[PDB]
């Protein structure tokens, strides 16, 4: 049986700007780097950056909704979002639901999110106000 | 500051086959399903499937190396990989080895992986057989 997420690998077009973004701007820990990649950690998340000549810098309009959300406390949310805004990081969506979320792009157009709250909190909200066609198990 | 992965959202072209893949074949826990999405969990991982008409099924040769790996134990690895092959699940190829892994595709061409081992184990293996240009911090 599967026990969780082992690692997330993002293809990047240029290693140096991506390391700067994830390590310096976002504060992740850099464990190792090589000619074509890097290993970072963010809490219990193992993140791999893989240099890939196939990766296009992709505008948000030309990619689908696939995205990766990082955990942050409500107390830290506003100052972290302000840091991204000062660095000029682009936003790809406004938060229109309950729950604190900030939607931002990485240098290659990967869709990222800061989110406060757990699955259990989302499910409780949804039991009060279910989406169209919602069934629980 | 960031503390890990909050959730992973995959855009899917058809909801029913994707739910079946992650729940029936991969054994993830289905918590809720509605007309345009589903919430699943895999250990600590919160997985969201989001129906997206923009999602195209892409051959692995024309998508980049971005991929998602799930943890499995040494005792279950081979028999789980055997069940996927028997079910006709397609495969893809990465440019580099990263230990005991099996690489497979979901119905929309998202690149998935089963992997045995932690970041710490990977770093120890790399010290004996480093990638080209590798440096450790
Ligand atoms: C088969 N099925 C299920 O188990 O939960 C559903 C929810 C919706 N909206 C539509 C179909 C199903
Ligand atoms: Mn999200
Ligand atoms: Mn991998």
CATH number, domain containing residue B44: 3.10.180.10
Q: If we measure between CA atoms, which residue out of B2, B8, B134 comes closest to residue B70?
A: B8
CA distance linking residue A131 with residue A117, whole number of Å: 18
Residue B117 tokens read as: 């081992």
Which of B6, B31, B45 has its CB closest to that of A137? B31
Q: Which residue from A2, A65, A80 is facing B50, i.e. has the nearest CB?
A: A65
Contacts of B63 in chain A (CB under 8 A): 54
Q: Read off φ and ψ for residue A29, nearest 5 degrees.
A: -90, 125
User: Rounded to whole angstroms, how far apart are CA atoms A117 and A77?
Assistant: 11
What is the residue range of B16's domain? 1-137
**How far apart are the CA of B82 and the centre of ligand 1, in A?**
29
Q: What is the dihedral of CA A78, B52, B92, B125, to 10 degrees?
A: 20
Scan for tokens 């049986």, then name that residue: A1
Method of structure determination: X-ray
Overall resolution, Å: 1.4
Locate the ligand 1 atom nearest the alpha carbon of residue A133 and give its number: 9
Report yes or no: B131 and B117 within 8 Å, Cβ to Cβ. no
| Dihedral angle of Cα A40, A106, B5, A52, to the nearest 10 degrees | -50
DSSP B91: B
Task: Say yes or no: CB of residue B33 within 6 Å of ligand 1.
Answer: yes
Comparing CA positions, the residue from A37, A52, A81, A36 lying closest to residue B1 is: A81
* Cα three-residue angle A124-A128-A133, rounded to 5 degrees: 100
Cβ-defined contact of A66 to B34 (cutoff 8 Å): no
A28 and A41 Cβ atoms separated by less than 8 Å: yes
Instruction: State the distance from the centre of ligand 1 to the C-alpha of B34, rounded, in angstroms.
Output: 7
Q: Which atom of ligand 1 is nearest to the CA of A134?
A: 9
Which residue from B3, B50, B64 is facing A72, i.e. has the nearest CB?
B3
Q: Which residues, including other chains, have CB under 8 Å from residue B53's CB and lie 6 or more apart?
A: B13
Answer whether B67 contacts ligand 1 (Cβ < 6 A): no
Beta strands A67-71 and A111-115 are parallel
Instruction: Please give the tally of structural domains in chain B.
Output: 1
Which DSSP state fits A17? H
d(CA B15, CA B37): 7
For A:28-87, CB contacts with B below 8 A are: 28, 30-37, 39, 41-46, 50, 52, 54-56, 63-73, 76, 80
Residue A20: CB atoms within 10 Å: 13
Report d(CA B42, CA B27) in Å as an integer. 8
Q: Is the CB of B137 under 6 A from ligand 1?
A: no
- List the one residue out of B41, B97, B43 whose CA is nearest residue A119: B41
- Chain A contact probe: residue of B5, B15, B136 with most A CBs at under 10 A: B5
């Amino acid at each position: 049986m599967l026990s969780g997420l082992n690692h997330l690998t993002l293809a990047v077009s240029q290693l140096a700007p991506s390391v700067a973004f994830y390590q310096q701007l976002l504060g992740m820990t850099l464990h190792a780097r090589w000619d074509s990649g890097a290993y970072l950690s963010c809490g219990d998340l193992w993140l791999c950056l893989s240099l890939d000549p196939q990766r296009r810098v992709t505008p948000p309009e030309e990619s689908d909704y696939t995205h990766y959300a990082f955990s942050i406390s409500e107390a830290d949310f506003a100052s972290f979002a302000a840091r991204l805004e000062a660095a000029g990081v682009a936003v790809w969506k406004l938060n229109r639901s309950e729950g604190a979320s900030h939607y931002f792009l990485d240098p290659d157009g990967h869709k990222l999110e800061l989110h406060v709250g757990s699955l259990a909190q989302r499910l409780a909200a949804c039991r009060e106000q279910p989406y169209k066609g919602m069934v629980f198990f």
